[PDB]
């Protein structure tokens, strides 16, 4: 008694785990202020004034 049961890995679960890791690595490398997120995850240079 008292084990942990985990299901079979789908390839869809496995590729989602890879793309989630890419997202968290982009957040570490790029920064996590809302302007840094926009500039790292998208091509966009937001003005500072409009983001307070």
């Amino acid at each position: 008694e008292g084990g942990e049961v985990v299901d079979n890995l789908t390839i869809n679960s496995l590729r989602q785990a890879f793309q989630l890791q890419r997202l968290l690595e982009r957040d570490a490398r790029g920064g996590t202020r809302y302007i840094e997120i926009i500039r790292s995850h998208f091509g966009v240079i937001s003005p500072d004034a409009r983001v307070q």
């Binding site: 790029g30 920064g31 202020r33 840094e36 500039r39």
Partner: peptide, 10 residues
């Protein structure tokens, strides 16, 4: 002056 690693600090 470009996008630095670890987010911006001047």
């Amino acid at each position: 002056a470009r996008s630095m690693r670890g987010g911006i600090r001047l």
